[PDB]
Scaffold this active site. Structure first.
Site, PDB file in Angstrom:
ATOM      1  N   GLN A  19       0.813  -1.206   0.000  1.00 46.44           N
ATOM      2  CA  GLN A  19       0.000   0.000   0.000  1.00 46.44           C
ATOM      3  C   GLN A  19       0.855   1.268   0.000  1.00 46.44           C
ATOM      4  O   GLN A  19       0.301   2.356  -0.174  1.00 46.44           O
ATOM      5  CB  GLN A  19      -0.945   0.021   1.208  1.00 46.44           C
ATOM      6  CG  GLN A  19      -0.207   0.151   2.535  1.00 46.44           C
ATOM      7  CD  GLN A  19      -1.151  -0.033   3.711  1.00 46.44           C
ATOM      8  OE1 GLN A  19      -1.453  -1.156   4.119  1.00 46.44           O
ATOM      9  NE2 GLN A  19      -1.592   1.071   4.290  1.00 46.44           N
ATOM     10  N   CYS A  25      -5.062   0.491   3.849  1.00 46.89           N
ATOM     11  CA  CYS A  25      -5.114  -0.919   4.259  1.00 46.89           C
ATOM     12  C   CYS A  25      -6.494  -1.509   4.032  1.00 46.89           C
ATOM     13  O   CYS A  25      -6.623  -2.653   3.586  1.00 46.89           O
ATOM     14  CB  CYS A  25      -4.737  -1.083   5.744  1.00 46.89           C
ATOM     15  SG  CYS A  25      -5.760   0.000   6.813  1.00 46.89           S
ATOM     16  N   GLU A  50      -7.262  -1.664  -5.871  1.00 48.63           N
ATOM     17  CA  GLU A  50      -7.361  -0.832  -4.664  1.00 48.63           C
ATOM     18  C   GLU A  50      -7.517   0.638  -5.004  1.00 48.63           C
ATOM     19  O   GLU A  50      -8.214   1.374  -4.283  1.00 48.63           O
ATOM     20  CB  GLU A  50      -6.133  -1.032  -3.770  1.00 48.63           C
ATOM     21  CG  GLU A  50      -6.055  -2.458  -3.223  1.00 48.63           C
ATOM     22  CD  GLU A  50      -5.378  -3.421  -4.207  1.00 48.63           C
ATOM     23  OE1 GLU A  50      -5.558  -4.637  -4.038  1.00 48.63           O
ATOM     24  OE2 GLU A  50      -4.708  -2.967  -5.172  1.00 48.63           O
ATOM     25  N   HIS A 163      -5.824  -1.295  11.661  1.00 43.12           N
ATOM     26  CA  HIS A 163      -5.191  -1.773  10.436  1.00 43.12           C
ATOM     27  C   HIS A 163      -6.016  -2.919   9.872  1.00 43.12           C
ATOM     28  O   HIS A 163      -6.385  -3.829  10.605  1.00 43.12           O
ATOM     29  CB  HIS A 163      -3.748  -2.233  10.741  1.00 43.12           C
ATOM     30  CG  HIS A 163      -2.977  -2.692   9.539  1.00 43.12           C
ATOM     31  ND1 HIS A 163      -2.864  -1.929   8.395  1.00 43.12           N
ATOM     32  CD2 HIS A 163      -2.272  -3.822   9.310  1.00 43.12           C
ATOM     33  CE1 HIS A 163      -2.134  -2.584   7.501  1.00 43.12           C
ATOM     34  NE2 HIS A 163      -1.768  -3.734   8.028  1.00 43.12           N
ATOM     35  N   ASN A 187      -0.728  -9.450   4.817  1.00 45.73           N
ATOM     36  CA  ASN A 187      -0.636  -8.016   5.022  1.00 45.73           C
ATOM     37  C   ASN A 187      -0.434  -7.354   3.653  1.00 45.73           C
ATOM     38  O   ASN A 187      -0.335  -8.020   2.606  1.00 45.73           O
ATOM     39  CB  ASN A 187       0.506  -7.719   6.019  1.00 45.73           C
ATOM     40  CG  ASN A 187       0.472  -6.308   6.615  1.00 45.73           C
ATOM     41  OD1 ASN A 187      -0.394  -5.509   6.375  1.00 45.73           O
ATOM     42  ND2 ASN A 187       1.512  -6.027   7.407  1.00 45.73           N
TER      43      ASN A 187
HETATM   44  C1  LIG Z   1      -4.746   1.389   7.273  1.00 43.27           C
HETATM   45  O1  LIG Z   1      -3.924   1.743   6.401  1.00 43.27           O
HETATM   46  C2  LIG Z   1      -5.519   2.557   7.833  1.00 43.27           C
HETATM   47  C3  LIG Z   1      -4.583   3.481   8.635  1.00 43.27           C
HETATM   48  C4  LIG Z   1      -5.327   4.700   9.211  1.00 43.27           C
HETATM   49  C5  LIG Z   1      -4.468   5.386  10.297  1.00 43.27           C
HETATM   50  C6  LIG Z   1      -5.508   5.718   8.099  1.00 43.27           C
HETATM   51  N1  LIG Z   1      -6.470   2.043   8.816  1.00 43.27           N
HETATM   52  C7  LIG Z   1      -7.887   2.143   8.653  1.00 43.27           C
HETATM   53  O2  LIG Z   1      -8.402   2.646   7.674  1.00 43.27           O
HETATM   54  C8  LIG Z   1      -8.698   1.522   9.786  1.00 43.27           C
HETATM   55  N2  LIG Z   1     -10.048   1.925   9.579  1.00 43.27           N
HETATM   56  S1  LIG Z   1     -10.755   2.966  10.727  1.00 43.27           S
HETATM   57  O3  LIG Z   1     -12.145   3.120  10.405  1.00 43.27           O
HETATM   58  O4  LIG Z   1     -10.618   2.322  12.052  1.00 43.27           O
HETATM   59  C9  LIG Z   1      -9.692   4.437  10.828  1.00 43.27           C
HETATM   60  C10 LIG Z   1      -8.799   4.462  11.790  1.00 43.27           C
HETATM   61  C11 LIG Z   1      -7.889   5.677  11.927  1.00 43.27           C
HETATM   62  C12 LIG Z   1      -8.012   6.654  11.059  1.00 43.27           C
HETATM   63  F1  LIG Z   1      -7.189   7.734  11.156  1.00 43.27           F
HETATM   64  C13 LIG Z   1      -9.050   6.593   9.936  1.00 43.27           C
HETATM   65  C14 LIG Z   1      -9.845   5.551   9.813  1.00 43.27           C
HETATM   66  C15 LIG Z   1      -8.583  -0.011   9.693  1.00 43.27           C
HETATM   67  C16 LIG Z   1      -9.305  -0.618  10.912  1.00 43.27           C
HETATM   68  C17 LIG Z   1      -9.180  -0.517   8.359  1.00 43.27           C
END
Ligand SMILES: *[C@@H](O)[C@H](CC(C)C)NC(=O)[C@@H](NS(=O)(=O)c1ccc(F)cc1)C(C)C
Length: 220
Positions: A19, A25, A50, A163, A187
């Site tokens: 990614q 993710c 993606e 994540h 991953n």
């Molecule tokens: C993975 O690359 C993402 C990293 C975040 C920090 C941008 N993780 C997610 O998108 C998570 N989804 S969430 O809805 O929990 C989330 C969490 C933190 C954020 F800042 C934005 C969104 C994961 C659980 C898919």
């Protein structure tokens, strides 16, 4: 369920992807689960875009490189009536405007199923459905530096996941009676991370790192 499962051996799983420096993710988790279910339906494994999800699934609640949810990605595929192939809509690791082309759509879904929030139900779904999208607490240096073996982090949370990844099977190390059990997890940080890009994550330790807390898959 069986004592062990590995859907890679059945043709359900594309190679590990990367990614980059984008919080996408959720998009990689969603394409992995959809790749598996489209293979289950058709017998053909086709890598999915993606970037299509990053650029286009805002209306369902995703936020591009600032995060998202796999269920929102499954809802976009349903709403949109399709998802382009990886080859036709390649990954750029940064948010751009939506360029979905239905000519190159190779997948669809009719919604999604959320799995009950415990590991026996997660195992049943992995055994009967295929690879499963999950969210985990990856927010520790131990996860960054993971090389091999079964990942167990004392400070992992079952409630606060950050994540999205893909469960492609499960099994055990050592003799069975030791209960040295793991989830086999794909991953999206490239094959140089982890074990060729995979991690075995602690299984049947009361939902370690939250792996059963937000598990789902698309209905095809
Ligand atoms: C993975 O690359 C993402 C990293 C975040 C920090 C941008 N993780 C997610 O998108 C998570 N989804 S969430 O809805 O929990 C989330 C969490 C933190 C954020 F800042 C934005 C969104 C994961 C659980 C898919």
């Amino acid at each position: 369920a069986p004592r062990s499962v590995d859907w890679r051996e059945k043709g359900y799983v594309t190679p590990v992807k990367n990614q980059g420096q984008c919080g996408s993710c959720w998009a990689f988790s969603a394409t992995g689960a959809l790749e598996g279910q489209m293979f289950r339906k058709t017998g053909r494994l086709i890598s999915l875009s993606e970037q299509n999800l990053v650029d286009c699934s805002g209306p369902q609640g995703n936020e591009g490189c600032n995060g998202g949810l796999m269920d929102y990605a499954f809802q976009y595929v349903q709403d949109n009536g399709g998802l382009d192939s990886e080859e036709s809509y390649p990954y750029e690791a940064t948010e751009e405007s939506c360029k979905y082309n239905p000519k190159y759509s190779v997948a669809n879904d009719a919604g999604f199923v959320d799995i009950p929030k415990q590991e026996k139900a997660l195992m049943k779904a992995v055994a009967t459905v295929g690879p499963i999208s999950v969210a985990i607490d990856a927010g520790h240096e131990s996860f960054l530096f993971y090389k091999e073996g079964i990942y167990f982090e004392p400070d992992c949370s079952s409630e606060d996941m950050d994540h999205g990844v893909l469960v492609v099977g499960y099994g055990f190390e050592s003799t069975e009676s030791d209960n040295n059990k793991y989830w086999l997890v794909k991953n999206s940080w490239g094959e140089e991370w982890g074990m060729g890009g995979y991690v075995k994550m602690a299984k049947d330790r009361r939902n370690h790192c939250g792996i059963a807390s937000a598990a789902s898959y698309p209905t095809v």
